[PDB]
């Protein structure tokens, strides 16, 4: 489980700036889910 959660933490850090998951890709109407943050927190604790 620790290995799995390290994997999800690192893959989340990788995805953090994916254009679909980041600021670009939505400027005309607005997705940029900030919930990434929460995941980080969980992994850290």
């Amino acid at each position: 489980v620790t290995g799995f959660f390290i994997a999800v933490s690192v893959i989340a850090n990788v995805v953090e700036t994916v254009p679909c998951g980041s600021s670009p890709g939505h400027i005309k109407e607005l997705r940029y889910a900030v919930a990434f943050f929460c995941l980080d927190t969980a992994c850290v604790m």
Partner: protein, 51 residues
């Protein structure tokens, strides 16, 4: 083995449910609505623009 695997996947399912519940409940996402609608010909002949 495979008891280790089933216990592991059960714990992963529980943790995934917890984290997705947090993901659903925590954020706001409520930007309401912005922008004003543009002008169309029906607006001209409405009583609104009568001088």
């Amino acid at each position: 083995w495979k008891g280790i695997a089933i216990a592991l996947l059960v714990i992963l399912v529980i943790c995934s449910l917890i984290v997705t519940s947090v993901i659903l409940l925590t954020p706001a996402e409520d930007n309401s609505l912005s922008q004003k609608k543009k002008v169309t010909v029906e607006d001209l002949f409405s009583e609104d623009f009568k001088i």
